[PDB]
Amino acid sequence: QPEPDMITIFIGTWNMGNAPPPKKITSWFLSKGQGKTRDDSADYIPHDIYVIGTQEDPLSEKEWLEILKHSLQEITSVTFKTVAIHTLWNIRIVVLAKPEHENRISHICTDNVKTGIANTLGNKGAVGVSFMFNGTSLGFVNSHLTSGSEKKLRRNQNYMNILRFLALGDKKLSPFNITHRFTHLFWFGDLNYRVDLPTWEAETIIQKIKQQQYADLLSHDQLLTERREQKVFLHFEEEEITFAPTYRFERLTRDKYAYTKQKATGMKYNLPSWCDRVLWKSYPLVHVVCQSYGSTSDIMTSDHSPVFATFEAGVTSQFVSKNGPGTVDSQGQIEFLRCYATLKTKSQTKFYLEFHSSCLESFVKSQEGENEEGSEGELVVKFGETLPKLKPIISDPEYLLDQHILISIKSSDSDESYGEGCIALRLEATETQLPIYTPLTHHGELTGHFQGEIKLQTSQ
Numbered sequence: 001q002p003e004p005d006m007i008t009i010f011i012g013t014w015n016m017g018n019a020p021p022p023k024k025i026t027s028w029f030l031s032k033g034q035g036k037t038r039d040d041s042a043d044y045i046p047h048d049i050y051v052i053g054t055q056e057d058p059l060s061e062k063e064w065l066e067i068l069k070h071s072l073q074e075i076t077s078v079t080f081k082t083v084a085i086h087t088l089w090n091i092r093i094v095v096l097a098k099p100e101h102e103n104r105i106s107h108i109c110t111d112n113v114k115t116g117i118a119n120t121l122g123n124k125g126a127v128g129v130s131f132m133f134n135g136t137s138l139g140f141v142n143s144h145l146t147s148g149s150e151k152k153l154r155r156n157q158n159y160m161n162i163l164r165f166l167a168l169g170d171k172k173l174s175p176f177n178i179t180h181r182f183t184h185l186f187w188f189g190d191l192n193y194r195v196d197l198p199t200w201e202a203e204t205i206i207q208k209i210k211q212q213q214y215a216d217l218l219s220h221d222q223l224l225t226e227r228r229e230q231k232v233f234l235h236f237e238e239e240e241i242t243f244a245p246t247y248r249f250e251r252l253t254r255d256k257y258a259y260t261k262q263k264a265t266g267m268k269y270n271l272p273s274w275c276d277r278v279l280w281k282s283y284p285l286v287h288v289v290c291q292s293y294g295s296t297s298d299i300m301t302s303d304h305s306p307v308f309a310t311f312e313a314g315v316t317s318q319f320v321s322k323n324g325p326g327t328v329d330s331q332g333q334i335e336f337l338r339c340y341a342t343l344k345t346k347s348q349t350k351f352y353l354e355f356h357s358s359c360l361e362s363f364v365k366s367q368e369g370e371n372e373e374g375s376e377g378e379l380v381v382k383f384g385e386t387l388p389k390l391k392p393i394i395s396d397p398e399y400l401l402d403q404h405i406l407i408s409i410k411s412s413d414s415d416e417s418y419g420e421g422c423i424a425l426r427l428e429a430t431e432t433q434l435p436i437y438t439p440l441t442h443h444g445e446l447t448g449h450f451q452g453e454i455k456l457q458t459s460q
């Protein structure tokens with residue numbers, strides 16, 4: 001049985017509004033309703049992995065697992081295996097996989113982050129799951145962020161706390177947060193960003209939704225605007241939104257948005273909004289295609305509609321050669337020429353680089369670079385030709401060209417990372433000097449750039 005080079009992943013996010021689900025929720029798992037929907041011809045084809053994020057979930061883990069597994073069995077006639085389940089308050093993530101993938105899945109991690117302090121600590125935060133699928137690392141984050149149209153800054157702060165403190169993936173990757181630890185990272189949930197228009201425009205907004213005219217609404221979506229100003233979800237992708245706002249509905253219909261201020265809303269307006277979202281971030285030059293992004297029309301127990309997204313995701317096999325793992329393969333090497341980091345820091349310390357990759361026996365520290373002043377005030381750290389030669393465990397190009405090198409630039413004085421990035425080895429050529437580039441981030445904020453040239457030697 002050959003190992004796959006591609007899998008399909010279902011991501012679901014549903015804020016259940018503290019109400020039990022209806023007896024049938026199969027439309028969710030089938031990507032049927034509004035938006036970018038899945039072809040009917042695919043309905044019996046199971047996804048490899050189903051990742052279900054809920055918010056305001058009133059069910060026990062047991063109650064929800066029974067509904068999920070029974071749903072997927074009805075659709076696919078497959079009995080899914082439970083990879084992981086993790087609940088923080090009423091925020092829950094479930095990972096289910098086809099039984100044939102049990103042997104391919106390892107290193108399962110779960111974690112949660114609680115957001116806010118005193119007042120604002122009590123029900124918002126995130127749960128997450130990571131694991132290895134053969135040679136590919138997968139992360140999944142389900143977050144319920146701060147509510148309310150006038151709290152987009154709080155949401156951005158909640159996001160930064162989650163990406164700093166959620167402890168998933170390989171703990172040896174100590175300079176890197178979840179935004180660098182995975183081949184593919186999926187981040188979804190009730191992110192609670194709103195359509196920022198005047199309250200008086202509520203009926204105009206509803207009119208526009210009834211006409212399926214979303215363009216003037218999406219231009220005021222806080223998540224799109226904050227992302228375009230690099231305030232949140234830097235370097236993440238989201239599929240175009242072609243479904244109606246998923247909040248806030250009157251329960252037991254979808255014919256009505258309930259937007260008016262009420263005691264139950266803290267006298268806040270809830271203008272129709274895309275609260276419920278799916279974003280992703282994959283390493284450079286890995287295959288990832290969104291094949292659906294939409295909302296269900298027939299599940300009406302909550303004031304939110306469920307959202308689905310499906311993805312084709314590139315995966316690699318767990319490679320073994322006569323040499324590595326357990327030693328290096330001297331027919332392989334990674335060299336770096338004309339390299340320099342540009343940092344936004346106003347500080348003056350020396351810096352060195354750390355290279356981390358599962359193609360190395362362990363991480364590699366460089367010599368200190370030479371600091372120079374850039375023409376526009378920037379700190380430029382010159383490595384020139386001084387970076388070490390990296391020694392991969394396996395030289396076969398069918399392995400090595402599928403790998404990535406994570407880079408941290410660290411202060412010599414504190415050993416603290418000032419910036420993290422990632423370089424793909426999926427080069428246009430081997431044994432050839434080729435430009436490389438990555439932005440550098442720290443706590444998910446842009447801190448600089450790393451650029452230079454690479455020269456990769458494989459066994460071919």
Ligand SMILES: NC(=O)c1cnc(C(F)(F)F)nc1
Pocket residue numbers: 081082083084097098101102103105106107108
């Ligand atoms: N390595 C594991 O502990 C593992 C457990 N369970 C599964 C499941 F749920 F797919 F069957 N896959 C892997």
